[PDB]
Amino acid sequence: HWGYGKHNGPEHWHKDFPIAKGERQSPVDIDTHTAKYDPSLKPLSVSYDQATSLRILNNGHAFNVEFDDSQDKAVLKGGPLDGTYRLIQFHFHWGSLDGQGSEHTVDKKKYAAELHLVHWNTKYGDFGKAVQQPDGLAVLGIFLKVGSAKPGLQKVVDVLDSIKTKGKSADFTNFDPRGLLPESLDYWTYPGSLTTPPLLECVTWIVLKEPISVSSEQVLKFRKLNFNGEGEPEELMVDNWRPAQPLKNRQIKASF
Ligand SMILES: [Hg+2]
Ligand SMILES: [Zn+2]
């Protein structure tokens, strides 16, 4: 099916998912000199104290750390957002080398990776209903650069040996996503879409300005993952990122 290679990569996705060429597609380039400080943006609230992780899954495209979202335990509100958005999962996109991997770019600059923390508008009852809505989803994007290790990422790094191939899952409880946040919550925001099929245009994007740094050895373990399922030829899970899409008639706002 859809993937990241020459023959099923993002340049092909439009054939199964015509909205690929839609009016509010993600990711985009963040032109810092075109983005406008928005004084009407309320402060951003990230409440991950009571977050309940359940498991980690390799879905043949990335890995998802999944959360119990049957209660308001880890929530996003404030900033551009109306009401409450509930954390369902996080995942990353990364490159084969450090000079690429992010989905969003800043002044055309690509980071080594990007973390996405995916939240759904509790107004819509469940994730499935929210992805039928222009304001159903809120994704918090955080860039990764290679430098010093990120201590609160290592529990993730160490579990990856056990979910090497498509469809493998491991138990993954008591993971604290607060360990992945940078010091600053400064951000850019714009209306967009999922960056993976079915590319639904339901997302308010909140991209933090301040990246987190991870070690070369942390990003390397990411790169030992497999796109393929157990017992198949080895395709390293790398370059699982969609490139910047046309901005069209959209405005990126700054919180700062
Ligand atoms: Hg939508
Ligand atoms: Zn993503």
Swiss-Prot record:
Entry cofactors: Zn(2+); Co(2+)
CDD domains cross-referenced by the UniProt entry: alpha_CA_I_II_III_XIII (cd03119)
Annotated cofactor note: Zinc. Can also use cobalt(II) with lower efficiency, but not copper(II), nickel(II) and manganese(II).
Protein name: Carbonic anhydrase 2
Effect noted on mutating L194F: Normal activity
A Pfam family matched in the record: Carb_anhydrase
Effect of N59L: Reduced activity
Effect noted on mutating H61W: Impaired activity, rescued by 4-methylimidazole (4-MI). Impaired activity, not rescued by 4-methylimidazole (4-MI)
Native organism: Homo sapiens
EC number: 4.2.1.1, 4.2.1.69
Recorded family membership: Belongs to the alpha-carbonic anhydrase family.
Effect the entry attributes to changing N59D: Strongly reduced activity
Phosphoserine modified-residue sites: S162, S169
UniProt-reported outcome of changing T195 to A/C/H/P: Strongly reduced activity
Source taxon at top rank: Eukaryota
Disease field: Osteopetrosis, autosomal recessive 3: A rare genetic disease characterized by abnormally dense bone, due to defective resorption of immature bone. Osteopetrosis occurs in two forms: a severe autosomal recessive form occurring in utero, infancy, or childhood, and a benign autosomal dominant form occurring in adolescence or adulthood. Recessive osteopetrosis commonly manifests in early infancy with macrocephaly, feeding difficulties, evolving blindness and deafness, bone marrow failure, severe anemia, and hepatosplenomegaly.
An annotated Gene Ontology molecular function: zinc ion binding
Binding-site residues, substrate: T195, T196
Stated regulation of activity: Activated by X-ray, histamine, L-adrenaline, L- and D-phenylalanine, L- and D-histidine, L-His-OMe and beta-Ala-His (carnosine).
InterPro entries documented for this protein: CA_dom, CA_dom_sf, Carbonic_anhydrase_a-class, Carbonic_anhydrase_a-class_CS
Catalytic reactions of this protein: hydrogencarbonate + H(+) = CO2 + H2O; urea = cyanamide + H2O
UniProt miscellaneous comment: Target of drugs used in treatments against glaucoma disorder and breast cancer.
PROSITE patterns: ALPHA_CA_1, ALPHA_CA_2
A GO CC annotation given for this chain: extracellular exosome
Alpha-carbonic anhydrase domain: residues covered: 1-256
Keyword Membrane: yes
Coiled-coil portions: none
